[PDB]
């Protein structure tokens, strides 16, 4: 095999097609059906394609291999190996030049726009209804004029000469040959130099680029029309003989036969000089046949013989799932593989798996033969086979010996994440079922209810090393998604341990003193002491407190027997305290965590195995069961229910009299029923929880019960409080189809019996649930496929880019408290710059250091609040990332290794968990100082810190300078405490009207009406003395027809008349009353500062929408630059807002629809990208205005909200990598080296600017603008075209790459997979690096 690269694609010239072909196929016949020898001139022909049987001619004159180039005189077939019949192509000489459907019907019709003729006309031409005048010489008719029948008639009669018109693909080919590429190209450049308008300039630039591509690539356009047509080798379009004298053939054979028929009939008709109409009909018919051959389905859909289904054409074979790339080039079918049902097998070690004898023998057959021949037990391979078929003891001994260290791969059908394939050492067992280690089931999401698994065998030495090193179970204990352990004990183990550790007030052997665990076990196994009984024991724990030395501390602790028995296994390093407690699910998980962090891997593995074994054993000894009497119906249920029924009856009767609406009664009933449910639940938990009143020596006592169902609840083994309720209480409220909640609940439980109605309702519930899970799984699968697709090519290429940039990460304190602390958020990230203690010049962390647990604890000891850390998005490396910018986090602990494909791991980690997807006063929870951020207040006369800013926040500083609680305080909210004041727990710090945003006046004086005329634009509807009114200052849209341009206003003047000016500014306060300006305080009351002017009253789809960046149909509006905004030309149909910069130029106008309400006033201080209208913001604006770190923080937080709502932890780095892959593209705004408008990746722009500015000449000095593109288009715009063709529209990408003459250096992973060479990732990176040195070297 040669070492090659660069697969090149281009238009095939007709002479090259003639070059490939070995012969003409003249007749459509294949074989004589009598003698099965092939036809002399047929789709299957020996003289063209090859000999049927190896090295023997058709007529049978020459059959020996001695002859290798001779061509039999009788049958013109050369004698060679039949394999060649797999590669020889044929050809058909078409009489009429025919168009290639792909280059015509593809949505952008490249023949169409290349010829600058719309698609509709070309279609009109292809079906032979009308002519077109192609280069009609010196007449009064243009060059692309379509001509109808009688238009051709009157033209011909009028213009005998100077009239050139023709029809069909031959006319089109004539048009193509005569085109001058460069002259039109230069003309187009001149036109672009003269034209300045967006859309026409874009279509023109695309077209000019197309012309440049043709003149550079060297393809001539006329080649789009076919003259000779190649025919695929026969073995690729087989004619297989079905058992029973019948044959099975692909439909392509039929299509080829039809094509040959139409060609031969057209040839004969031409030789006969038939009238034009008939030859035109024949040419049309040949067109249908050919286009059905190429892509059947873009026409009248020529169906197949007697099947009513459309037959499959070549395009169908390539494109699509069933066809190709997915099925046969990414979805192969390996050898040495098996499948079977999975089973428990508790006795196994964590690193091993039970494998049936017979499958193992079948798989390892060739190894067995090799070893048998090596030992000399068998002379030859057939004797080895016979020895395997007898199955003697020696064979089993050799099989045991060879299997010894050879590892096998286990896979489970939905491989969601990388833990779907793992390696194990097999142990031969009887039976036909595979035995799977229990601890790994959680990783596989495996269940023993008929699930099956596949088993592959790695052959080569490198495969063995890879399986044992990278894939072995013990090397993968941490999930790649988050750092936490994956292998935690599931249900039986935790139940057994829980039973073991819980203590009881009084039992046998209370308070006796034991010298160690060994006699504790002596006592338990002899039945002289209970497994749980409080006792004082002497124990020697070990602690590595010094620099790696273990110090024994030995003292007397008061514990249970069970905890000591468990202590027997526990390795040295762990504190005794760990086991001293109840030891539930959480306790065991954190136990494993500590064991890993202190000792390391190997002790953790052995400790997990020991835990499993002991848990199973003592769970079996416990004998825990579940009887009908074990779940006690609370005695006071019936009273509570009857009371609630009486209450519902009273509220319904008080409804029938008509003092309360139906909805109010509904709400009341639902709330009272909820309260009754909570009451019964609490009563049940009280009854069941602590009921064991067992007696000590004298009086009695009570303790946490040993009720088996209670232990199952409390231990966290199975069930939650909700299910306990569902077993023994009333099973709450239900939802009807539409989501509305039924009024009467289900009062019965499964211990009792339901009746028809309650069952029926719950049936509906369960049905909806199941359907939900089904659709959820389908959508999940699809989403994760897209994710893994887009991010595949990203690889860690460089060790360190060396940038100082990074994102300043803070703990996300959503509202009430700290949903997620800093320490976990920063663990394993390198720092962007040294962080200082709360006192300057006290460096805590040198320049970029990887933040491991020790640094995080050190930060916890201090009070660092926010840390700028290097992020992947800001990484400087070109074409990949550097180790430092990423960080450490992995299934292993150390810094990321160069070469790891983080894209795929990130995509899997994001995808797999995706299968479960009044307000009057603020009340500070903890005693702290109140602090206001982004505000400018003005103390009024009432003694309130009046809020005049719309972006005001009220955070909470604790004793040591940290923001515990954070709230957003709107404009017009009454405040109580200012700055410095310490606030007691749950004290009202703020106040505001729920259904009212007041407008606050800054100065005093009399309210003056200006352009506030009565009757034309306003309607005086005023109330009585107390000074109530409904004066309505309407907006521009709702203003009356006469008062369309007259804008009523309210100027705030003083007692004398002069408009009092805002302090410090000269602006005459002229408040144009906005829409719905309810002027309550009428003319005649000296305005106080603060009078109101106008009262103004998730899951998977959400994730998909965030990741597709869809504008949420009501976007908020932002500010571009800061400075005084102002109004403008009023009521054109969309009200104008002109942002006036205090320094910069004014002319930025933004139209606003009538319905939009604005929250900010004209004379306000906006910041760039500040909110102007309320509502959800579309990510595009935030990215464009605020920049990268803002949009990345927004996306990460928005996704993490959905994910944490379900309680699934994911590390931000994966989302970060995806986001970085999303914004790969930019758009050029200046000039100097690019084409001034081309969408170009940010990578090429950065590298070219680095080059240019490195070069002594300034050159381009180019400035660019970032762009954000959705994952679909971003994947569509990949560099390699094989990646895109692998999954997208095959016709489109194939046509683009064919016309562009593109050259693929493969450079990627998926390309290398397709070509079957080593991927450039991981173990193969070095290989590619070696090849990398071979290029561009000596």
């Amino acid at each position: 095999t040669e070492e090659f690269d660069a697969i090149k694609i281009a238009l095939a010239s007709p002479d090259m097609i003639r070059s490939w072909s070995f012969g003409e196929v003249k007749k459509p016949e294949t074989i004589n059906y009598r003698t099965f020898k092939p036809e002399r001139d047929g789709l299957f022909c020996a003289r063209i394609f090859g000999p049927v049987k190896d090295y023997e001619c058709l007529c049978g004159k020459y059959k020996r291999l001695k002859h290798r180039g001779v061509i039999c005189e009788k049958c013109g077939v050369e004698v060679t190996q039949t394999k060649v019949r797999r590669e020889r192509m044929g050809h058909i000489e078409l009489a009429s030049p025919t168009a290639h459907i792909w280059f015509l019907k593809s949505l952008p019709s490249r023949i169409g726009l290349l010829l600058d003729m719309p698609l509709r006309d070309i279609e009109r031409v292809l079906y032979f209804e009308s002519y077109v005048v192609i280069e009609g010489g010196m007449t009064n008719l243009e060059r692309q004029q379509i001509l109808t029948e009688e238009q051709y008639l009157d033209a011909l009669e009028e213009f005998g000469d100077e009239f050139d018109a023709k029809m069909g693909a031959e006319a089109i080919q004539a048009l193509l040959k005569s085109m001058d590429l460069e002259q039109e190209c230069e003309q187009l450049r001149e036109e672009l130099n003269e034209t300045n308008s967006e859309t026409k300039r874009k279509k023109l630039t695309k077209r000019i680029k197309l012309l440049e591509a043709f003149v550079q690539s060297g393809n001539k356009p006329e080649w789009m029309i076919l003259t000779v047509l190649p025919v695929l080798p026969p073995d690729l379009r087989p004619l297989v003989p079905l058992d029973g004298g019948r044959f099975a053939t692909s439909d392509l054979n039929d299509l080829y036969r039809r094509v040959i028929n139409r060609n031969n009939r057209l040839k004969r008709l031409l030789d006969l000089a038939a009238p034009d109409i008939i030859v035109r009909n024949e040419k049309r018919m040949l067109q249908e046949a050919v286009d059905a051959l190429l892509d059947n389905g873009r026409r009248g859909r020529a169906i197949t013989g007697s099947n009513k289904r459309p037959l499959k054409s070549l395009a169908d074979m390539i494109k699509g799932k069933q066809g190709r790339f997915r099925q046969n080039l990414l979805g192969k079918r390996v050898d040495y593989s098996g499948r079977s049902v999975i089973t428990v097998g508790p006795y196994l070690r964590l690193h091993q798996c039970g494998l049936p004898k017979k499958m193992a023998l079948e798989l390892f057959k060739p190894f067995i033969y090799g070893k048998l021949e090596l030992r000399g037990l068998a002379t030859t391979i057939k004797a080895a086979k016979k020895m395997v078929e007898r199955e003697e003891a020696v064979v089993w001994d050799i099989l045991d010996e060879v299997i010894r260290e050879h590892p096998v791969l286990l896979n489970r059908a939905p491989t969601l994440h990388r833990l779907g394939i793992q390696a194990f050492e097999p142990v031969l067992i009887e039976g036909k079922a595979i035995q799977l280690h229990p601890l790994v089931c959680a990783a596989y999401n495996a269940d023993f209810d008929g699930d099956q698994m596949a088993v592959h065998v790695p052959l080569t030495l490198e495969a063995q090393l890879e399986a044992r090193a990278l894939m072995m179970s013990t090397n993968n204990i941490l999930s790649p998604a988050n750092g936490e352990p994956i292998i935690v004990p599931s249900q039986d183990v935790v139940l057994g341990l829980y039973y073991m550790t819980r203590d009881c007030v009084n039992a046998k052997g209370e308070g006796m003193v034991l010298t160690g665990p060994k006699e504790a076990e002596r006592l338990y196994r002899s039945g002289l002491a209970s497994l749980h009984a409080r006792v004082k024991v002497r124990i020697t724990e070990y602690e590595k407190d010094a620099n790696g030395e273990l110090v024994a501390k030995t003292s007397l602790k008061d514990t249970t027997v069970g905890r000591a028995i468990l202590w027997m296994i526990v390795p040295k390093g762990l504190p005794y305290s760990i086991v001293n407690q109840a030891l539930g699910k959480k306790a065991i998980s954190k136990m494993l965590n500590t064991c890993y962090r202190i000792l390391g891997l190997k002790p953790t593995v052995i400790f997990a195995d020991q835990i499993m074994y002991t848990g199973f054993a003592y769970a079996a000894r416990s004998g825990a069961s579940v009887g009908i009497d074990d779940m006690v119906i609370p005695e006071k249920k019936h009273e509570i229910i009857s009371e609630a029924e009486a209450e519902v009856a009273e509220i319904q009767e008080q409804f029938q009299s008509g003092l309360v609406t139906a909805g109010e009664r509904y709400n009341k009933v639902i709330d009272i029923w909820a309260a009754a449910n909570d009451r019964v639940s609490k009563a049940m938990m009280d009854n069941l929880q602590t009921e064991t009143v067992i007696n000590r020596d004298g009086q009695e006592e009570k303790q946490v019960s040993f009720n088996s169902i209670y232990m199952m609840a409390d231990s966290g083994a199975r069930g939650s409080a909700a299910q306990i309720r569902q077993l023994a209480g009333m099973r709450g409220l239900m939802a009807k189809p539409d989501g509305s909640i039924i009024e009467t609940p289900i009062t019965a439980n499964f211990r009792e019996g339901l009746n028809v109605l309650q069952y029926f309702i719950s049936t509906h519930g369960a049905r909806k649930g199941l359907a939900d899970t089904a659709l959820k799984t389908a959508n999940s699968g699809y989403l994760t496929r897209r994710l893994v697709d887009v991010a595949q090519d990203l690889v860690v290429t460089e060790d360190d880019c060396g940038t100082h940039e990074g994102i300043m990460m803070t703990p996300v304190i959503e509202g009430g408290d700290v949903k997620e602390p800093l320490r976990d958020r920063v663990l394993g990230r390198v720092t962007a710059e040294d962080v200082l203690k709360p006192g300057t010049a006290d460096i805590l962390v040198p320049r970029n250091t990887l933040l491991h647990e020790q640094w995080c604890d050190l930060l916890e000891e201090n009070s660092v609040d926010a840390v700028k850390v290097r992020s992947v998005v800001s990484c400087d490396t070109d074409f990949g990332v550097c180790a430092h910018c990423y960080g450490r986090d992995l299934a292993r602990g150390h810094i990321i290794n160069k070469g790891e494909a983080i894209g795929v791991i990130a995509a899997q980690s994001i995808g797999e968990p995706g299968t479960q997807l009044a307000e009057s006063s603020i009340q500070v929870k903890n005693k702290g100082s109140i602090k206001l951020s982004n505000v400018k207040s003005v103390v009024n006369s009432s003694g309130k810190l009046v809020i005049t800013s719309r972006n005001t926040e009220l955070k909470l500083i604790d004793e040591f300078g940290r923001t515990k609680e954070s709230y957003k305080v709107p404009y017009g909210a009454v405040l109580a405490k200012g700055d410095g004041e310490q606030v007691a727990g749950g004290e009202t710090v703020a106040n505001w009207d729920p259904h009212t945003m007041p407008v606050i006046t800054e100065v005093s004086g009399f309210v003056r009406f200006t352009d506030m005329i009565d009757g034309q634009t306003i309607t005086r509807q005023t109330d009585e003395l107390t000074g109530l009114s409904s004066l309505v200052v309407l907006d521009s849209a709702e203003r009356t027809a006469g008062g369309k341009d007259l804008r009523p206003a309210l100027k705030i003047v003083d007692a004398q008349g002069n408009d009092v000016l805002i302090p410090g500014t000269d602006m005459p306060a002229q408040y144009f009353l906005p829409g719905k300006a309810i002027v309550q305080l009428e003319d005649g009351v000296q305005i106080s500062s603060g009078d109101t002017l106008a009262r103004i009253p998730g899951g998977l789809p959400r994730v998909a929408d965030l990741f597709e960046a869809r504008r949420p149909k009501e976007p908020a509006i932002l500010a571009e630059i800061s400075g005084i905004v102002s109004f403008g030309k009023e009521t054109k149909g969309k009200r104008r807002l002109v942002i006036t910069p205090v320094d910069g130029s004014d002319p930025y106008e933004e139209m606003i629809p009538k319905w939009r309400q604005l929250n900010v006033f004209e004379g306000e201080r906006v910041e760039r990208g500040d909110v102007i209208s309320d509502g959800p913001e579309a990510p595009h604006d935030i990215l464009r205005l605020r920049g990268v770190h803002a949009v990345t923080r927004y996306i990460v937080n928005e996704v993490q909200d959905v994910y944490r709502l379900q309680g699934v932890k994911i590390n931000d780095k994966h989302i970060e990598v995806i986001v970085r892959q999303m914004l790969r593209k930019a758009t050029i705004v200046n000039a100097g080296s690019s084409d001034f408008l081309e969408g170009e990746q940010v990578e090429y722009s950065r590298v070219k600017i680095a080059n240019r500015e490195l070069e002594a000449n300034g050159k381009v000095g180019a400035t660019y603008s970032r762009d954000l593109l959705g994952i679909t288009k971003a994947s569509l715009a990949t560099e390699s075209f094989i990646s895109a063709a692998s999954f997208q529209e095959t016709t489109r990408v194939l046509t683009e790459a064919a016309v562009a003459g593109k050259r693929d250096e493969l450079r990627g992973l998926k390309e290398n997979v397709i070509v079957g060479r080593l991927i450039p990732a991981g173990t193969g990176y070095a290989y590619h690096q070696d090849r990398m040195r071979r290029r561009a070297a000596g």
Binding site: V334, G338, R339, A1321, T1323
Partner: protein, 99 residues
């Protein structure tokens, strides 16, 4: 069900699909992605060519395994050549370059 080696398919020289005839398991794209998450390049390579698609490769590997040596010679998958032939059957010239 299990198979070591057996009959291969006619057109694409991959092992038959099914249970009546021995037939191998389908190593799908998701499994490929799983392997890519690890650095497992040689296992995937052999799985892709020597195990299924390379005729000379499969026979050479059978003989080599029998000999008690464990190497490989990946070559180019036949299905890729079929792809080339099918694309060439259209008017598209796609060539494997060399330098």
């Amino acid at each position: 069900h299990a198979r070591s080696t057996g009959s291969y398919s006619l057109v694409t020289q991959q092992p038959l699909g099914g249970k009546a005839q021995f037939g191998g398991q389908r190593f799908g794209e998701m499994e490929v992605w799983a392997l890519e998450a690890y650095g497992a390049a040689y296992t995937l390579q052999e799985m892709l060519t020597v195990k299924s698609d390379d005729v000379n490769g499969r026979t050479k590997m059978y003989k080599n395994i029998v000999d008690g040596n464990h190497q490989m010679e990946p070559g180019m998958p036949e299905s890729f050549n079929v792809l080339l032939k099918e694309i060439r059957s259209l008017g598209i010239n796609i060539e494997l370059e060399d330098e």
